[PDB]
Design a protein around this nucleic acid. Structure first.
Ligand code: MG
Ligand code: ZN
Ligand code: ZN
Lengths: 107, 1265
DNA sequence: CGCCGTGTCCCTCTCGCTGGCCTATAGGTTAGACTTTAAGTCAATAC
RNA sequence: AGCGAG
DNA sequence: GTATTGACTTAAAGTCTAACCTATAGGATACTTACCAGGGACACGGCG
C-alpha cells in the first residue's frame, strides 16, 4: 500500500470532562457590530485584537483600547512621482495645462 | 448524534449569512503547507487556526497541550486545542470581492434564474459573463415628465446635425460648381467631365449616407430610451456608453452577477406570481405553456419562505481540509486532493480582484477579473458545464466539487449504498457433494483470518495465551494449537456466501461453515443453480454476521436449507440437476426384456420374478441376476402405495408402516421411493426433470421445509451414485450420423439449383430468391433433424441426456450430428449458403468462417444485454422501494377477474395454459358461484391446486381474486391482497419487501431474454411507458371501420354507433399490416369494439389508458410483459408485474386547480389528491378535476417525495437543484434513505412491531429455575 | 397559434486480479553557546 | 491497460 | 525499614548573539489581438 499520512498524529488519552483547566470567555467586537466570544485561558493576557470568525479583526470590548499605529499607505503614485520629479517643474506643467484649458474655454 | 433523533433531512438554499455562519473563519490566502517544514500555513486552505489542529490537543506552536487544556485557544497562534478529527467537520468561507451566481441555478436546463427573472438563457449568460449590460431600474416618472424636455434637447441636437448636413450639401454644391466650371471651361474628354461630376455626386451620396448614419445614431438611441424598462439587455456597449453619458440618469444599468443580484432585489415575488397566475388562467397557447413552466419556479420561492437570493453568492463555503486531504505518500511525494487547486484558483482571482479594485483600474481589466472569478467559482462547483473543462497536469479535467456526487462512481452510489466491509473474504468455489444443504466448507486459513477476533478471545480464555497481544501473535504465526480452538469458535456460527452479480435474493445465502483443508470454499451442488455458480473459476465472497440479530437473521431468514423455492415462481431451486437428474432417470427408468424381469408363464414353472422384500431384491441385484431397471413384483411393507391401490385394498385408513402390498415396479423405483418421506405415496414413474420438479413442489407444499431439505439431500446423494453407475459417456462412436443425409442433401440442392436458374433468367429479384433459398434450406434442416431423431436409439448417452431433462436441447444434438443449418449474417439476416455439415463431420474452412459471425455477434450481444438488464433491474428496484406489506387485510371488495379455462365451442373447459402464473397463489375476493348454486370456495382462500381443480370441476371460468392493483391500503400493500408468498409457500408476512422481490424476479430472467421490439427492449419500453415504434392506433368508439387503400399511407376511419363525431386516423403507413380481428382481418365497414387494435404491432399504453380507464391499461401491461417473458420460456408470477404496474399508476394529472395550490399539468399522488379534495369540500367546495396518468419506472421513481432517494437514483444535480429550490424535507421513510443514513430499514425485522418485541421468561420457567 | 428542425443533457451490469535573468534592503527565524535554575543523585545517620 | 466469472 | 541533611552533578530552560531565510522592490533600444456510438427527452428559433 502507498501508506500515506495526514501528518499530525493521534493521541488516545482518556477523555476527561471533570477536572478541566479554568477558562475566561473574552468578548470581542468587529467593525460590523458583531460580537464574538473566545475562550482564552486565565493564565495569559487577553489580546487586544482577534481575527474573528467574521474574517475581519475585532478589538476587545472592555476598556483598555490600546489603539496602536501602523505604516501609512504602503506607497502611492504621487510618492513614486516625487522620487523622480520635483515641485517646480510639476507646478510649471500645471500652469501650462491651466493656460491651455483657459484658452480652450475663453481663448 | 443518534439515528433515532434523525426524523427529517431538509435541503434548501444556503444564503450568504448561512455560509458565513457555518464558517469558523475565512480562508484569505491561497496556501496549503510550508515547502520545508511541511506544516499547515496561516490563513491558508489547510489553516490550523480555522479548521482545527492536525495533531490531537495542541496549538500550532506548542504552548497548550493535552486534554487538560480542552477547549482553549493558544493566544500566540490562535489554534483551538482539541481533537484533530474536527478537521473533517469544520468549514471555512471565502468572502468574494464581487458577487457570483451559483452555476446550478443558471446553466442547468431549464435555467431557474431565467425562469424566475424571465430572462432568456442567452441573455442571462451575456449579463452574468460581462457580454451585455442590463437595466435594473427606470424612473418612469422622470422618464414621463422629461419626455418633453429631453425631447426638446434631442430636437436641438437633431437640428444641429441637420444643419451640418445641409452645410456639407452646400459645400458639395460649391465644389460641384467648381468641377463643372473646370470641365466645361477647359478642353477635356466628353466623359471625363461626367466622370468627375459623378464622382462628386457619389461623394455627396456618401455624405448623405453619413447623414443617415447620424440620424440612426440619434433616433435609435431616443427610441431605446423611450422603451427603456427593467430587465432589458443591451449589446454593443458603444450605445450603452453614449446613453450613460447623455441620459445617464433616468436609468441604472449593470453587468454581471451583481446586476442579477440587483434585479432579484428589485423583484416582488408576490406580484409576479399573481400576474403569472392570471396569465395562465386567462391566456392560452404556447404563451400559457411558458407561463406555466415559470410558475413551477416562481411558486417554489413563494410557497416556502426561501428568498430567491441564494442563487447569487457573496461567500463561498470551504469544505473541511480532511475531505480534501494532502497526504505525504511513501517517498515524500505529496498528493493533493484536486479540490485545493480549484479553491486556490478561486482565492487567487478573488484576491487579485480585491487588489485591482483597491488600486483603481480601468473597467476593462476589472470586468475581465470579475468574469474570471465567476468562471473560477463555476469550475469549482461544476467543471466542464460551461466551456472547456478546467484541466490539470496531463491534460485531464479537474475533479470538481459536483463530480463527487454524480455517477456510478459518485458518492451517492459508490460509498453510501454500497460499501466495503470488514470480516469478509473471497475464494474460488469447488463442489462438495459430501456436504449438507445447510453447510459450506471454509478454508482453514480464511476462517482463521475471518474469526481471529473470536479465536484470540477463546485461546486467551483457554489459557493457551496469557493476554490479548500474545494471542494475536500466536494467531499471526498460526501456532499448531490454534486450530482446535478455531473449530470450537466456528461452531454453529453462520456465514453469508455471496456471488456477484446478485441477480436475485437467493444469491446471498447463510451456511453453517465447516473447516476444509485448502484454500477453496466447498459449495453444496444444489445451491449452484440458486447462485448460478459453476466450478470453472467462479469465485465468491464470505461475510461474517457479528451481532445477535445478525446471527439470528442469517440462521433463520437466510439459511440455505430454508430457501428451496424460487421467490419468483415458486418452483424449487435446490432440486437435483445435471448429474443427479441423469442418475435418478437411469435408476428409475424401466427397460423391457431385462435380466430378472417378471414373466407370468405357467404350465412348467411359476412366475419366477417375484421378490419377498426390497432386501431380497437388493441381494439379487448384488448377484448378476436382477438388474435395477427390470420390471418385477415385490412385497412392500414400508412405502405407502398410490391413491388408487390404497383406496382399493385399504380404502379408508391404510396404515402402511406395517401393512404389506404388491408393487409391480422396478427395483430402482423402490430404491428411489425409499428416499422420499414415509407419508409420500409410491410414485412409480420414470423421473424426468419435470417429474422430479413436480415431486419437490408437492413435497414442499405438503411437508415441512426441513423434511424437504433432507429429502432433497438424499435425492442428491442417490443421483450422484447412480449417475456414476449410469455409464453415460461420449465417443465418436456414440454420435450417429443419419444414413439418409446425402439423399436429402441432393433432393434439396436440386431445388436450390432450380431457384438459382430462376434467378439467372430474371424471374425474381435478389431478395425473393434469397427468401426462397432460406425457406428451402430451413425445410431441409427440419427434415434432416427428423431423420436423425428417428434414427437414434433411446439408450444413447447423447439422446439420454437431452431427453431426460438433465441438460441440453435437441437442436444441439442436431448441430453435433446432421446439419447445423442456416447461419446468421453479421448484419442479422440469414446466409443462404448454408453450413451443410455437422460438427462430428467437421466444418470446412469457409463453413467455419461463416459460423463464426453469429457466435461473435452473440458474445457481444450477451455483454450489452447483461448491461441493459442490470440497468432495468436497478430502475425496477428503485421505483418500487416503498411497496412492502403493512397490514393483514384491507377488506376491500375490489378485485381482478382471471379467466382460468376457456369454454370450448363444442362445450368443455380446457385449462388455460398460463394459469400457474395467473390464478395460483392468489386470494379470492368474491365467493365462487356454480350455476347460481352454493359456494365451491368462498372469499379468503389461498386458491391452490386443489382449489383450481375444484373450480374446473364445477364448470366456472372467471373468478375474482385479490391483487395488489386493487389494494385499499395507502402505504404499501397488505398481506391478503398480495396473496401467498411464493418462496415461503404461505401467506406473506407483515414486513416483506415485496417491491424488491418483484423487481428482482422481473429483472433476473433478463440476460436470458434473447433481445416490433420483442425482447428486453420491449419490456424496457413497456415499463418506461414510452410510445412504441409501431404506434398502432386503437379505436376510440364502437363503430364501423371505413378503411381505404392509400399510397404511402392508409386511413382507418371509423363511423361510430353513438352516432357522434367519427374520427379519422393519420398517415398510417402502408408498411404496417392490418390486424386479424375476430378470424376475418379488419374489413372495411366492420363493427369494432372500444379497444380492438386496428393496425399490427403494439399500442402505446397511454392511449389505451385514456380510452379504457386504469383497469384495461393494467391488464394490457401485465399481458404484454408476461407475453414477452413467456416467448422465451420463463415463468414469473403475475403479482410481481402487478406490483410494478401498481407503482406506475399512482398519480393524476391536474386539469383544474380549483382553488387549492394545484398547478395544471402537475402530477400529484392520488392519495394526496383525495386528501386535498376532502379538505376542500368543506369551507367552500372547489373540486379540482383530475385525470389518471401512466408514468414510467424512471419518471415514477424521480417523482418520489424523498429527495435523498431520487438524488441517489439518477440525475443527482437536477434532483438536488429542484429540492433545494423547493425546501423539500425528507421524512426518511423508504428503504434507500434508511440505508443511506445507516439506520434500520422499515421492512422485515426492522418494522416497529417486530423490532420492539418484549422478551422475558415465562413464569413457570422462572419458578422451575 | 401548430409543426419542424436543431442544439443540449443524461444514460448506458456486478464482482475481482495484476502493475507503471540578476542586484540591493530590510526584516524574521533558528542554531548555538552561556548562565541560571529546577531536578536527579549519593553518602552518612538516627530512630 | 491487458485478464477472469456471469 | 523509614524518618532526614548536606553536598554533587545534570537536563531544561531562558536568553543574547549571529546567519540564513523571507517579503519586497527594481531593472529604460524596441518589441502592442493565443491557440467516429446511439437513444431518449426537453428546450429554443423558423416557418407557415
Ligand atoms: Mg462460470
Ligand atoms: Zn500556540
Ligand atoms: Zn389489500
Amino acid at each position: 500500500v502507498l501508506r500515506g499520512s495526514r501528518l499530525g498524529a493521534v493521541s488516545y488519552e482518556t477523555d476527561r470532562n471533570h477536572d478541566l483547566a479554568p477558562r475566561q470567555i473574552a468578548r470581542y467586537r468587529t467593525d460590523n457590530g458583531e460580537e464574538f466570544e473566545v475562550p482564552f485561558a486565565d493564565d495569559a493576557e487577553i489580546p487586544g485584537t482577534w481575527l474573528c470568525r467574521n474574517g475581519m479583526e475585532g478589538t476587545l470590548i472592555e476598556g483598555d483600547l490600546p489603539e496602536p499605529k501602523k505604516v501609512k499607505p504602503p506607497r502611492t503614485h504621487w510618492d513614486m512621482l516625487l522620487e523622480r520629479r520635483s515641485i517646480e517643474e510639476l507646478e510649471e506643467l500645471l500652469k501650462e495645462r491651466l493656460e491651455l484649458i483657459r484658452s480652450r474655454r475663453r481663448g | 448524534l443518534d439515528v433515532n433523533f434523525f426524523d427529517e433531512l431538509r435541503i434548501g438554499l444556503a444564503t450568504a449569512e448561512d455560509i458565513r455562519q457555518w464558517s469558523y473563519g475565512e480562508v484569505k490566502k491561497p496556501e496549503t503547507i510550508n515547502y520545508r517544514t511541511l506544516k499547515p500555513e496561516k490563513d491558508g486552505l489547510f489553516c490550523e487556526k480555522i479548521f482545527g489542529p492536525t495533531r490531537d490537543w495542541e496549538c500550532y506552536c506548542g504552548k497548550y497541550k493535552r486534554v487538560r487544556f480542552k477547549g482553549i485557544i493558544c493566544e500566540r497562534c490562535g489554534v483551538e486545542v482539541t481533537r484533530a478529527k474536527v478537521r473533517r467537520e469544520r468549514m471555512g468561507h471565502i468572502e468574494l470581492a464581487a458577487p457570483v451566481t451559483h452555476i446550478w441555478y443558471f446553466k442547468g436546463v431549464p435555467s431557474r434564474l431565467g425562469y424566475l427573472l424571465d430572462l432568456a438563457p442567452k441573455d442571462l449568460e451575456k449579463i452574468i459573463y460581462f457580454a451585455a449590460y442590463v437595466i435594473t431600474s427606470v424612473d418612469e416618472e422622470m422618464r414621463h415628465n422629461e419626455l418633453s424636455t429631453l425631447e426638446a434637447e434631442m430636437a436641438v441636437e437633431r437640428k444641429a446635425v441637420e444643419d451640418q448636413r445641409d452645410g456639407e450639401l452646400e459645400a458639395r454644391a460649391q465644389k460641384l460648381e467648381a468641377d463643372l466650371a473646370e470641365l466645361e471651361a477647359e478642353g477635356a474628354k466628353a466623359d471625363a467631365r461626367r466622370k468627375v461630376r459623378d464622382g462628386g455626386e457619389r461623394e455627396m451620396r456618401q455624405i448623405r449616407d453619413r447623414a443617415q448614419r447620424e440620424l440612426d445614431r440619434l433616433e435609435d438611441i431616443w427610441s431605446t430610451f423611450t422603451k427603456l424598462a427593467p430587465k432589458q439587455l443591451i449589446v454593443d456597449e458603444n450605445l450603452y456608453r453614449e446613453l450613460v453619458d447623455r441620459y445617464g440618469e433616468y436609468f441604472t444599468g449593470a453587468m454581471g452577477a451583481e446586476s442579477i443580484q440587483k434585479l432579484i432585489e428589485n423583484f416582488d415575488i408576490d406580484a409576479e406570481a399573481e400576474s403569472l397566475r392570471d396569465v395562465i388562467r386567462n391566456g392560452k397557447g404556447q404563451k400559457k405553456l411558458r407561463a406555466l413552466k415559470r410558475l413551477k419556479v416562481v411558486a417554489a420561492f413563494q410557497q416556502s419562505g426561501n428568498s430567491p437570493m441564494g442563487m447569487v453568492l457573496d461567500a463561498v463555503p470551504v469544505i473541511p481540509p480532511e475531505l480534501r486531504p494532502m497526504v505525504q505518500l511513501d517517498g515524500g511525494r505529496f498528493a493533493t486532493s484536486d479540490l485545493n487547486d480549484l479553491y486556490r484558483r478561486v482565492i487567487n482571482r478573488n484576491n487579485r480582484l480585491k487588489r485591482l479594485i483597491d488600486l483603481g483600474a480601468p473597467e476593462i481589466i476589472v470586468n475581465n477579473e470579475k468574469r474570471m472569478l465567476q468562471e473560477s467559482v463555476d469550475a469549482l462547483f461544476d467543471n466542464g458545464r460551461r466551456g472547456r473543462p478546467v484541466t490539470g497536469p496531463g491534460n485531464r479535467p479537474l475533479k470538481s466539487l459536483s463530480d463527487l456526487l454524480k455517477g456510478k462512481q459518485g458518492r451517492f452510489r459508490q460509498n453510501l449504498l454500497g460499501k466495503r466491509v470488514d470480516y469478509s473474504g473471497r475464494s474460488v468455489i469447488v463442489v462438495g457433494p459430501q456436504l449438507k444443504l445447510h453447510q459450506c466448507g471454509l478454508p482453514k486459513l480464511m476462517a482463521l483470518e475471518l474469526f481471529k477476533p473470536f479465536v484470540m478471545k477463546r485461546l486467551v480464555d483457554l489459557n493457551h495465551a496469557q493476554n490479548i497481544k500474545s494471542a494475536k501473535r500466536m494467531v499471526e504465526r498460526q501456532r499448531p494449537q490454534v486450530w482446535d480452538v478455531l473449530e470450537e469458535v466456528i461452531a454453529e456460527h453462520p456465514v453469508l456466501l455471496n456471488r456477484a452479480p446478485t441477480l436475485h435474493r437467493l444469491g446471498i445465502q447463510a451456511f453453517e461453515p465447516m473447516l476444509v483443508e485448502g484454500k477453496a470454499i466447498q459449495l453444496h451442488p444444489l445451491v449452484c443453480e440458486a447462485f448460478n455458480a459453476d466450478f470453472d473459476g467462479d469465485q465468491m465472497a464470505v461475510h461474517l454476521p457479528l451481532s445477535a440479530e445478525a446471527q439470528a437473521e442469517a440462521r433463520i431468514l437466510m439459511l440455505s436449507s430454508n430457501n428451496i423455492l424460487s421467490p419468483a415462481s415458486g418452483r424449487p431451486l435446490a432440486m437435483p440437476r445435471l448429474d443427479m437428474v441423469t442418475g435418478l432417470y437411469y435408476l428409475t427408468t424401466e427397460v423391457p426384456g431385462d435380466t430378472g424381469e417378471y414373466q407370468p408363464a405357467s404350465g412348467d414353472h411359476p412366475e419366477t420374478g417375484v421378490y419377498s422384500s426390497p432386501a431380497e431384491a437388493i441381494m439379487a441385484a448384488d448377484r448378476g441376476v436382477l438388474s435395477v431397471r427390470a420390471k418385477i413384483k415385490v412385497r412392500l411393507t414400508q412405502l405407502r402405495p398410490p391413491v388408487e391401490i390404497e383406496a382399493e385394498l385399504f380404502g379408508h385408513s391404510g396404515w402402511q408402516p406395517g401393512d404389506a402390498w404388491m408393487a409391480e415396479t422396478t427395483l430402482g423405483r423402490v430404491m428411489f421411493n425409499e428416499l422420499l418421506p414415509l407419508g409420500y405415496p409410491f410414485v412409480n414413474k420414470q423421473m424426468h426433470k419435470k417429474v422430479q420438479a413436480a415431486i419437490i413442489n408437492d413435497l414442499a407444499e405438503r411437508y415441512p421445509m426441513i423434511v424437504v431439505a433432507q429429502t432433497v439431500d438424499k435425492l442428491k446423494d442417490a443421483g450422484f451414485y447412480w449417475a456414476t453407475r449410469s455409464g453415460v459417456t461420449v465417443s465418436m462412436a456414440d454420435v450417429l450420423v443419419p444414413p439418409r443425409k446425402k439423399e436429402i442433401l441432393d433432393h434439396y440442392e436440386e431445388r436450390a439449383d432450380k431457384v438459382e436458374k430462376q434467378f439467372q433468367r430474371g424471374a425474381l429479384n435478389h431478395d425473393e430468391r434469397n427468401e426462397a433459398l432460406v425457406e428451402i434450406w430451413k425445410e431441409a434442416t427440419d427434415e434432416v433433424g427428423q431423420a436423425l431423431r428417428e434414427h437414434y436409439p433411446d439408450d444413447n448417452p447423447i439422446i439420454t441426456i437431452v431427453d431426460s431433462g438433465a441438460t441440453g436441447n435437441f437442436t444441439q444434438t442436431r448441430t453435433l450430428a446432421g446439419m447445423k443449418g442456416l447461419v446468421t449474417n453479421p448484419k442479422g439476416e440469414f446466409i443462404p449458403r448454408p453450413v451443410k455439415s455437422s460438427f462430428r463431420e467437421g466444418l470446412t474452412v469457409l463453413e467455419y468462417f461463416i459460423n463464426t459471425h453469429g457466435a461473435r455477434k452473440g458474445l457481444a450481444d450477451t455483454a450489452l444485454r447483461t448491461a441493459d438488464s442490470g440497468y432495468l433491474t436497478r430502475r425496477l428496484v428503485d421505483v418500487s422501494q416503498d411497496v412492502i406489506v403493512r397490514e393483514h387485510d384491507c377488506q376491500t371488495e375490489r378485485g381482478i377477474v382471471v379467466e382460468l379455462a376457456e369454454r370450448a365451442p363444442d362445450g368443455t373447459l380446457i385449462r388455460d395454459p398460463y394459469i400457474e402464473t395467473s390464478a395460483y397463489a392468489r386470494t379470492l375476493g368474491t365467493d365462487a358461484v356454480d350455476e347460481a348454486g352454493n359456494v365451491i370456495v368462498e372469499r379468503g382462500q389461498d386458491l391452490g391446486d386443489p382449489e383450481i381443480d375444484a373450480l374446473l370441476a364445477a364448470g366456472i371460468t372467471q373468478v375474482k381474486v385479490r391483487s395488489v392493483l386493487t389494494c385499499a391500503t395507502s402505504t404499501g400493500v397488505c398481506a391478503t391482497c398480495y396473496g401467498r408468498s411464493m418462496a415461503t409457500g404461505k401467506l406473506v408476512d407483515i414486513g416483506e419487501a415485496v417491491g424488491i422481490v418483484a423487481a428482482q424476479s422481473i429483472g433476473e430472467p433478463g440476460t436470458q431474454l434473447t433481445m416490433i421490439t420483442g425482447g428486453l427492449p420491449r419490456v424496457q419500453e413497456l415499463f418506461e411507458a414510452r410510445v412504441p415504434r409501431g404506434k398502432a392506433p386503437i379505436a376510440d368508439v364502437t363503430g364501423r371501420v371505413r378503411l381505404e387503400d392509400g399510397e404511402r399511407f392508409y386511413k382507418i376511419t371509423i363511423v361510430p354507433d353513438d352516432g357522434g363525431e367519427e374520427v379519422v386516423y393519420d398517415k398510417i403507413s402502408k408498411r404496417q399490416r392490418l390486424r386479424v380481428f375476430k378470424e376475418r382481418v379488419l374489413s372495411d365497414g366492420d363493427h369494432v369494439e372500444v379497444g380492438q387494435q386496428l393496425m399490427e404491432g403494439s399500442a402505446d399504453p397511454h392511449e389505451v389508458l385514456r380510452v379504457q380507464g386504469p383497469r384495461e391499461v393494467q391488464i394490457h401491461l401485465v399481458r404484454e410483459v408476461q407475453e414477452v417473458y413467456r416467448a422465451q420460456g420463463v415463468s414469473i408470477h403475475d403479482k410481481h408485474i402487478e406490483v410494478i404496474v401498481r407503482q406506475m399508476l399512482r398519480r393524476v394529472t391536474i386539469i383544474d386547480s380549483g382553488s387549492t395550490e394545484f398547478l395544471p399539468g402537475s402530477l400529484i399522488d392520488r392519495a394526496e389528491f383525495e386528501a386535498e379534495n376532502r379538505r376542500v369540500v368543506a369551507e367552500g367546495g372547489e373540486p379540482a378535476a383530475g385525470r389518471p396518468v401512466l408514468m414510467g419506472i424512471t419518471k415514477a421513481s424521480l417523482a418520489t417525495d424523498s429527495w435523498l432517494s431520487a438524488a441517489s437514483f439518477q440525475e443527482t444535480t437536477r434532483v438536488l437543484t429542484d429540492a433545494a429550490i423547493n425546501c423539500r424535507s425528507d421524512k426518511l421513510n423508504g428503504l434507500k434513505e434508511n440505508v443511506i443514513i445507516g439506520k434500520l430499514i422499515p421492512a422485515g425485522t426492522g418494522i416497529n412491531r417486530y423490532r420492539n418485541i418484549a422478551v422475558q421468561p415465562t413464569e413457570e420457567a422462572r419458578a422451575a429455575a
